[PDB]
RNA sequence: UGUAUGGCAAGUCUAACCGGAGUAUCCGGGGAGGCACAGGGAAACCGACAUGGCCGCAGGGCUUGCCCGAGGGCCGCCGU
RNA sequence: UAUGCCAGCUGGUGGAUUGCUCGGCUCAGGCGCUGAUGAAGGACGUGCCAAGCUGCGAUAAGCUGUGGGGAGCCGCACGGAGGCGAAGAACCACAGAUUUCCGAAUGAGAAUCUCUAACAAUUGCUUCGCGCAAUGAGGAACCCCGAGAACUGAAACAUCUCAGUAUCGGGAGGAACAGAAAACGCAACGUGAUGUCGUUAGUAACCGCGAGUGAACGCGAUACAGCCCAAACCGAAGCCCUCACGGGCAAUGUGGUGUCAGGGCUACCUCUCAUCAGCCGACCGUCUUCACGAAGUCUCUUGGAAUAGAGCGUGAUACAGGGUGACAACCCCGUACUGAAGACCAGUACGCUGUGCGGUAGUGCCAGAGUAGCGGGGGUUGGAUAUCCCUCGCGAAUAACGCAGGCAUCGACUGCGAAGGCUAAACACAACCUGAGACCGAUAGUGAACAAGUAGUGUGAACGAACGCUGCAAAGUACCCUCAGAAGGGAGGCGAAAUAGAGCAUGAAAUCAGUUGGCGAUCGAGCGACAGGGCAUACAAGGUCCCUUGACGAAUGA
């Protein structure tokens, strides 16, 4: 059982979006967030640079960390970003909260899941 | 409700027969007893292996890969900007208590670097020279002969 | 956001920008953790005498006299846990660490979040406080630190429609249970926290349920008593500013 | 101290001179104005009015002051025994108020009239 | 040594102790040192894949079987 | 229906339960030696009446002085008699008087007494006389120096482990011990007395290389403080006792100088604010005690009693806690604020007096021996070749020399001067004072809330309990009847309550008396569960239930 009220809300909002709109991604991300913290994603930048492409939103079902270089102009969506991660992404792209990604894209289209 | 909290009424508290949880016999001896007899399993084998050199004749090098230096060049604006020039002795942490500084060659070198350190590996040179640049050995690093 | 400053008569005397920390998302689980730690860290070590019940040469007679193998002395059972006057089997021990640790960042985030909960009028009313305001926290001028009388602070809070909270706290409860015999007979609701800058308000401290604090050291406990976020607070203009870099 | 056990201990085990504070009663409006005090150590000879017991409303002279039991005997505030004898009902000075004082002592009068000390 | 939850994250945590104070709580300071950030070798000593290939779950895409396919799987290759 | 079974009712018995806390338990701060000037401890005394406790000592629950305190008092302990106190008692603080006998116990002996002037015994000084002094014994633990197990662990057991633990002998203090490098050895162009705390690290090291055992340098902190002899060169310039006189000590050396920034001596430069000795002598803080100290005891209702409810009002630098006939900031003590005193810090810091720091050149004048070191045998340690120590034997150099830097020898390099000595502060404990508590709450918590180390057991060493609660106030039951009766009983009186009447709040179960309902002297034993009948039932907190008929109608089904 989760103890964070904000994480509980995010999961509920991800579910509401997958059931209402035409998406399967937000319900898939919700299922990984309901799982234990150790299973959650701890993704560094060097991985988003390798597998992501432009005009396709990167969804991290965990947290983005600041190791490595990111050159690509990508919109990265996560539960949280480290202080350095958010700074390094905003220089070349855009660090967006998963809560914003649900309002901007409720259908969960043109999105890549990275772990 | 924990496991511990549900034990009142169980009699044996999960130990099986009440003839079980007694003394060290239930453990097969106290501590590491029988590590070579009845409980030899998954124990490191008996015996001596090797020797140790005296601690004050032991050198401890401070290591850093080219990948760490190269990934943080734009962030290291507090250092020299050449035609980049960086003294490795100022980058590595715990370089005070260490005997010498060594640059190892793991990863890629995407920039043109002029590195100054006490020691370099064969692969640390190949990657800096092959990506257009030099490797400068310190006056302390003049031990290689 | 903007926070309206009030003078000693309760009239609007300008307004200053409400600092960024008051927009920190309310996180009750983290606030509750910081309070649980503070309350546990002031708890004293205790334990029964290490030799209680062991001061006897009592021996068991063994088999033979139709009696249980219980250590006896002068035909009276002793020492063992099942015996009257015997030792306590697993008693409270002094050696036990009754303190809880907390990461500085996790504790600092809780102080910030508790400070932020103070800026929400609905949370403040949900916590229990009685008041007739829309804007919260109550921001008063630095000339508050110069007040000497308690009755003068009453008048200011009556002018600020925030005195109804002290009427809530003007009722002591005589607790159920033996805490009474140990000096913990009474308890009362927590009312208004007064955060100043130089010295804690000597004038406001005796008000029913009131707590006084300073912006350099105001913690999670005085900001959120019992771990419950949203305390009705009054800040000094300089306190509001100093509580920004926390 | 703050501990109840220690508070009652210090009161019940207080030395004779410290027991004077246990036999103090409040002064009337006129006497509070005249001497600048709220209360006084009740003396045998003072006139007092009962404010709380079954004898509430009655006036009388203080006949005895027992420091040991920390109680006073007031005139006509009695209990009738089985044989018919009228024995005094001990009163706690906290339930009593002083209407008139006995100032035969020069030291009690001096203490009552000075602003630096209290009686 | 696991697990659940929470903070921070290529870092993380302070210990003794110091200052403050509302004086055992609490606020600030303290990174000494620990663990992590490279390994292999008794030692001397040497020192690595920020991805080269193929499958493919979830998810996404399309003109609805076809593409992209993190994680995962099978290999290569690299250090000693 | 006898004996009797089950449940209940009234009354016992019993003392659980609930409520209460004069005691404990634990943590924290402060403080900390006593004794031949006879301690601590014990014995026996001591009161108007006095058995226990407490106090006290033949001046015996007390005497004197100063200060505080105050109209009361004569301890625990509420009696009777009597007495003391305004000539200022009680009570508290400080100081003083007295202070029996045994007790280190010291004139000698002795189960607390006795016999004929006593530092007994061992010492130092010495007027060689017990003339002047010292030691002895105690203390909660802490501290230092010695002696030193075993159960146990290794699943046996011997080395190892338990453990330098338990226990024993000796000894100091308020704290001990340690301590100004013959150091370290991140080997350095580096550190710089010592404890202690954190870490270094379960690392190095030990080990039937099994089980196990286990540092240090360094670093970050705490607190910081460095000095004196021996000898060289001087050579009585000196020291102790005494008011003095005078005496004693001292050439086998008192005293000066000096102490690795080596020193001395010789020749010079300059200078001192170092050091050592001595005088003066706190602030602040901390701990404790004390003085002062705001505001309702108004209305109505209930009550035995407002501290309750409703109404009106007040203080607050004070809404901590306690008391008071029930829930109290404003009734009483206190509490905040301010101020006073004592103790500790501390005879310390600062200040002062005096002395005088240091440098150059020359000089083989001086610089601690059974030592350094080697060997035999043991203990101890992580100490391994490379810990520390004991024992037996052997045994050096002289600064131009010597020791150390984790095997030995020689050289180099770096460090440092052993075999003489002193030393503040930071740290341990908890007797003592004070404070605190998510500790216990009378079979708990101390063995001990009570007569508690009490009663009691044992020749002795030693062992060792149980017992808390009337009531607002004793108003603690007058009078009368009965009786062998201060018994008990009856009647009666008090109180809100006696089913609060003395081990007296509440008053469970086991269980007992009486009694109610059900069963019962022809009948069979896990005592019941589930169904269904009899008989029994005040209210309350449950309100359903029966029969004709009718509607619906699964499986089944005439
Ligand atoms: Cl990654
Ligand atoms: Cl090695
Ligand atoms: Cl060093
Ligand atoms: Mg016990
Ligand atoms: Mg209860
Ligand atoms: Mg007066
Ligand atoms: Mg004798
Ligand atoms: Mg044995
Ligand atoms: Mg064994
Ligand atoms: Mg074996
Ligand atoms: Mg050992
Ligand atoms: Mg060392
Ligand atoms: Mg001299
Ligand atoms: Mg040994
Ligand atoms: Mg007991
Ligand atoms: Mg009773
Ligand atoms: Na068992
Ligand atoms: Na270092
Ligand atoms: Na005992
Ligand atoms: Na039996
Ligand atoms: Na503890
Ligand atoms: Na560090
Ligand atoms: Na019979
Ligand atoms: Na003391
Ligand atoms: Na007596
Ligand atoms: Na005496
Ligand atoms: Na003597
Ligand atoms: Na003599
Ligand atoms: Na065994
Ligand atoms: Na055996
Ligand atoms: Na061994
Ligand atoms: Na009263
Ligand atoms: Na030897
Ligand atoms: Na050395
Ligand atoms: Na009892
Ligand atoms: Na029936
Ligand atoms: Sr089990
Ligand atoms: Sr056992
Ligand atoms: Sr074997
Ligand atoms: Sr470092
Ligand atoms: Sr008395
Ligand atoms: Sr009494
Ligand atoms: Sr930190
Ligand atoms: Sr020093
Ligand atoms: Sr020497
Ligand atoms: Sr009992
Ligand atoms: Sr015997
Ligand atoms: Sr009667
Ligand atoms: Sr049968
Ligand atoms: Sr049908």
In chain A the domains, ranked by start, together with CATH numbers, are 1-115 (3.100.10.10)
Q: Which CATH class is domain B51-144?
A: alpha beta
Query: Is the Cβ–Cβ distance between C99 and C40 less than 8 Å?
Result: yes
Q: Report DSSP letters for A27-92, one per residue.
A: HHHHHHHSS-TTTS-EEEHHHHHHH--TTSEEE-SSEEE--S---S--EEEESEE-HHHHHHHHHH
Task: Tell me the C-alpha distance between B120 and B103, whole Å.
Answer: 5
Of C208, C143, C204, C192, which is closest to residue C10 (Cα–Cα)?
A: C143
CATH architecture of B1-50: Irregular (4.10)
Of C150, C127, C122, C102, which is closest to residue C223 (Cα–Cα)?
A: C127
List of chain A residues whose C-beta atoms are within 8 Å of the C-beta of residue C29: 3-5
Instruction: Give the distance (Å) from ligand 3 centre to CA of residue B97.
Output: 13
Reading the block at residue B31, the tokens are 């501590």
Task: Tell me the C-alpha distance between A16 and A102, whole Å.
Answer: 10
Q: Alpha carbon B92 to chain centroid distance?
A: 15
Name the experimental technique: X-ray
Of B106, B9, B126, which is closest to residue B65 (Cα–Cα)?
A: B106
Instruction: Give the distance (Å) from ligand 14 centre to CA of residue C243.
Output: 63
Q: Omega into C137 within 30° of 0, i.e. cis? A: yes
Which nucleotide has its C1' atom closest to residue D55's CA?
F305
Task: Tell me the C-alpha distance between C97 and C243, whole Å.
Answer: 33
Task: Tell me the C-alpha distance between C243 and C196, whole Å.
Answer: 10
Between residue 40 and residue 99 of chain D, the positions with Cβ below 7 Å from nucleic chain F are 41-44, 51-56, 64-68, 79-84, 87, 89-90, 92-95, 97
List of chain C residues whose C-beta atoms are within 8 Å of the C-beta of residue A4: 27, 29
DSSP label at B25?
G
Task: Tell me the C-alpha distance between C162 and C135, whole Å.
Answer: 11
Task: Tell me the C-alpha distance between C58 and C74, whole Å.
Answer: 8
Reading the block at residue D112, the tokens are 């009552």
Question: Which residues are near ligand 42, the ion (C-beta closer than 5 Å)?
Answer: D 68
Burial of B132 (0-12, 13-18, 19+ CB in 10 A): exposed
B110: nearest CA partner in chain A: A69
Q: Which residue is nearest to nucleotide F155 (CA to C1')?
A: B29
Burial of B86 (0-12, 13-18, 19+ CB in 10 A): buried
In sequence order, what are the beta bridge partners of B114?
A: B85
Task: Tell me the C-alpha distance between B127 and D18, whole Å.
Answer: 93
Nearest Cα of chain C lies from the Cα of A5 at a distance, in angstroms, of 7
Task: Tell me the C-alpha distance between C181 and C177, whole Å.
Answer: 9
3-state secondary structure D68-103: CCCEEEECCCEEECCCCCEEECCECHHHEEEEECCC
- Helices vs. strands in chain B: H and E counts, helices first: 2, 6
Task: Tell me the C-alpha distance between B84 and B124, whole Å.
Answer: 16
How is chain B split into domains, by residue range?
1-50, 51-144
Which nucleotide has its C1' atom closest to residue C216's CA?
E27
How is chain D split into domains, by residue range?
1-119
Do at least 3 CB pairs under 8 Å connect D with C?
yes
CA distances from A44 to A32, A36, A63, C112, D15 (A): 18, 20, 9, 28, 77
Record: contact D5-C185, CB cut-off 8 A: no
Q: Which CATH class is domain D1-119?
A: mainly beta
Q: Which residues contact B25 (CB under 8 A, 6 or more apart)?
A: none
A71: nearest CA partner in chain B: B71
- Contacts across the A-C interface (CB distance below 8 Å): 8
Q: Is the CB of residue C183 less than 8 Å away from at least one CB of chain D?
A: yes
Q: Is the CB of residue C182 less than 8 Å away from at least one CB of chain D?
A: yes
- Secondary element (H or E) of residue C241: helix C237-242
The CA-to-CA distance between both ends of chain D, in Å, stands at: 25
DSSP label at D31?
H
- What strand order describes the sheet that includes C233-236? C12-17, C2-6, C138-140, C233-236, C193-196, C211-214
Which residue ranges form the domains of chain C, and what is each CATH number?
1-246 (3.40.1370.10)
Stated in angstroms to one decimal place, the resolution of this structure is: 2.7
Instruction: Give the distance (Å) from ligand 15 centre to CA of residue D95.
Output: 40
Query: Is the Cβ–Cβ distance between A30 and A9 less than 8 Å?
Result: no
């Amino acid at each position: 059982s989760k103890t964070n009220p904000r994480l509980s809300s995010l999961i509920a909002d991800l579910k509401s979006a997958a059931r209402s709109s035409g998406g399967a991604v937000w319900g898939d991300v919700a299922e990984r967030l309901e799982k234990p913290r150790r299973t959650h994603a701890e993704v560094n930048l060097g991985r988003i640079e390798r597998y992501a492409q432009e005009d396709e939103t990167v969804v991290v079902p965990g947290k983005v960390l600041g190791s490595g270089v990111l050159q690509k102009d990508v919109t990265v969506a996560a539960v949280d970003f480290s202080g350095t991660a958010e700074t390094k992404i905003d220089q070349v792209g855009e660090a967006v909260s998963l809560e914003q990604a649900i309002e901007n894209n409720p259908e969960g289209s043109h999105v890549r899941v990275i772990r | 409700t924990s496991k511990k909290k549900r034990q009142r009424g169980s009699r044996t508290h999960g130990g099986g027969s009440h003839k079980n949880r007694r003394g060290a016999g239930h453990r097969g001896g106290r501590g590491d007893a029988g590590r070579d007899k009845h409980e030899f399993h998954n124990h490191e084998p008996l015996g001596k292996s090797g020797f140790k050199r005296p601690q004050k004749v032991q050198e401890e090098a401070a290591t850093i890969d080219v990948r760490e230096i190269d990934e943080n060049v734009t962030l290291l604006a507090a250092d020299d900007v050449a035609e980049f020039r960086v003294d490795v002795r100022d980058v590595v942490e715990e370089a005070d208590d260490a005997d010498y500084v060594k640059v190892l060659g793991a990863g890629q070198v995407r920039h043109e670097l002029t590195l100054i350190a006490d020691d370099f590996s064969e692969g640390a040179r190949e990657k800096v020279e092959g990506a257009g640049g030099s490797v400068e050995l310190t006056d302390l690093g003049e031990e290689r002969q | 956001m903007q926070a309206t400053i009030y003078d000693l008569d309760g009239n609007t005397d300008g307004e200053v920008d409400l600092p960024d920390v008051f927009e920190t998302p309310v996180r009750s689980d983290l606030i509750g953790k910081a309070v649980r730690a503070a309350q546990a860290n002031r708890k004293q070590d205790y334990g029964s005498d290490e030799y209680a019940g062991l001061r006897t040469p009592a021996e068991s007679f063994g088999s033979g006299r139709g009696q249980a193998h219980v250590p006896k002395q002068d035909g009276r059972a002793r020492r063992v846990p099942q015996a009257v006057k015997g030792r306590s089997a697993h008693p409270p021990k002094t050696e036990k660490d009754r303190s809880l640790d907390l990461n500085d960042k996790e504790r600092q985030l809780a102080v910030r979040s508790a400070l932020a909960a103070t800026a929400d009028a609905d949370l403040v009313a949900d916590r229990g406080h009685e008041f007739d305001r829309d804007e919260v926290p109550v921001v008063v001028s630095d000339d508050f630190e110069d007040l000497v009388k308690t009755q003068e602070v009453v008048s200011l809070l009556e002018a600020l429609d925030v005195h109804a909270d002290i009427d809530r706290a003007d009722e002591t409860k005589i607790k159920a249970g033996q805490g009474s015999a140990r000096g913990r007979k009474y308890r009362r609701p927590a009312s208004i926290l007064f955060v100043t800058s130089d010295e804690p308000s000597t004038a406001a401290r005796n008000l029913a349920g009131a707590d006084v604090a300073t912006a350099s050291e105001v913690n999670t406990e005085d900001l959120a008593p019992g771990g419950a976020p949203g305390r009705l607070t009054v800040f000094t203009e300089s306190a509001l500013a100093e509580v920004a870099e926390r | 101290s703050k501990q109840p056990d220690k508070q009652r201990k210090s009161q019940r085990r207080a030395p004779l001179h410290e027991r004077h504070k246990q036999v103090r009663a409040t002064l009337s409006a006129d006497l509070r104005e005249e001497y600048g005090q709220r209360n006084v150590r009740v003396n045998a000879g003072d006139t007092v009015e009962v404010l709380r017991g079954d004898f509430a409303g009655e006036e009388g002279e203080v006949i005895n002051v027992d420091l040991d039991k920390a109680v006073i005997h007031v005139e006509d505030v009695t209990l009738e025994k089985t044989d018919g004898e009228e024995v005094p009902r001990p009163l706690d000075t906290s339930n009593v108020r002083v209407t008139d004082l006995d100032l035969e002592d020069e030291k009690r009068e001096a203490r009552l009239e000075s602003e630096d000390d209290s009686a």
